[PDB]
Design a protein around this ligand. Structure first.
Ligand SMILES: O=P([O-])(O)O
Length: 321
């Protein structure tokens, strides 16, 4: 029995809570995860106050070498646009990336705007103001969401850009993925970006999006998996999965990372962190799929195991796996 502590991204917090609960029941090891968003996770592992950090924004090779850190992917998820449009069902509104951007820029103000109605011909769109919601805390989901908007709206790209934290033109700030969820639910007219789990479990209506290739997709585990189908995992783990080509490829997809130290000053702790995530890879794929997360392919998991053996050591040079 060991007590491990992790902190970071809220994006995969439901799968990690679920994995942790099952592992305790099967083995008695305790995992404590604090959802505080990816920036916090990164600071906390750097400070050495947790056993493991989590972030959906990959550090660069230089950055990992400078801090003594190793990073590895766990699951693939999808970010959706949760909406509160009185009278609209889940999956009936269709947005494109340029339209989505123009909402977040503050350019489109009403739900029956010409640009929105042209995308959804059948619908009877209300004349309700749009209330944009966005994150207040340094976030991995913000990263992924502003990475996607920088590729499909050139005014966003030039005026706001990409980051964990940016200068939001308009909108109300919610803390965590659970805070955007709560916000949408209370505000008639609201739109907020959440990892798909948080809209499904809260029963929030969500849109469809038009893929890179120009077809409207739904967000579904399969569709998240489809967006990752042509990723070259053998070159890097830091893959960008936003606006991918292919059939039924969800446009705002992403993987997520775990960060640990390479020179493990507490080898027992470090050894138990690896066993947990090995356990999850080996047996956790149903729980992940049950929260609509796609799993990594077997070849990637084999990559991580090979890199565990080469990189993770104690202060005597000895490997931990
Ligand atoms: O996963 P987040 O909390 O860093 O968005």
């Amino acid at each position: 029995e060991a007590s491990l502590t992790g902190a970071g991204a809220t994006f995969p917090a439901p799968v990690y809570a679920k994995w942790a609960d099952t592992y305790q029941k099967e083995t008695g090891n305790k995992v404590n995860y604090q959802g505080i968003g990816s920036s916090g996770g990164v600071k906390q592992i750097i400070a050495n106050t947790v056993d493991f950090g989590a972030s959906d924004a990959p550090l660069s090779d230089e950055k990992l070498a400078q801090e003594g850190l190793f990073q590895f992917p766990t699951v693939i998820g999808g970010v959706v646009l949760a909406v509160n449009i009185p009278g609209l069902k889940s999956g009936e509104l269709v947005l494109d990336g340029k339209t989505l951007g123009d909402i977040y820029l503050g350019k489109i103000k009403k739900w029956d705007d010409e640009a929105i109605a042209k995308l959804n011909p059948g619908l009877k769109l209300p004349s309700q103001n749009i209330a944009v919601v966005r994150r207040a805390d340094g976030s991995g989901t913000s990263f992924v969401f502003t990475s996607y908007l920088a590729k499909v709206n050139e005014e966003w790209k030039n005026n706001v850009g990409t980051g964990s934290t940016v200068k939001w033109p308009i909108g109300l700030g919610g803390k965590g993925n659970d805070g955007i969820a709560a916000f949408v639910q209370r505000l008639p007219g609201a739109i907020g970006y959440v990892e798909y789990c948080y809209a499904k479990q809260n029963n929030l209506a969500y849109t469809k999006l038009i893929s890179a290739d120009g077809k409207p997709v739904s967000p579904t585990e399969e569709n998240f998996a489809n967006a990752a189908k042509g990723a070259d995992w053998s070159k890097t783990f830091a893959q960008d999965l936003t606006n991918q080509k292919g059939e039924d490829a969800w446009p705002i997809t992403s993987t997520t990372f775990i960060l640990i130290h390479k020179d493990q000053k507490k080898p027992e702790q470090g050894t138990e962190v690896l066993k947990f995530f090995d356990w999850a890879y080996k047996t956790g794929a149903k729980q992940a799929n049950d929260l609509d997360y796609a799993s990594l392919p077997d070849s990637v998991v084999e990559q991580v195991r090979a890199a565990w053996k080469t990189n993770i050591k104690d202060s005597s040079g000895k490997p931990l796996y």
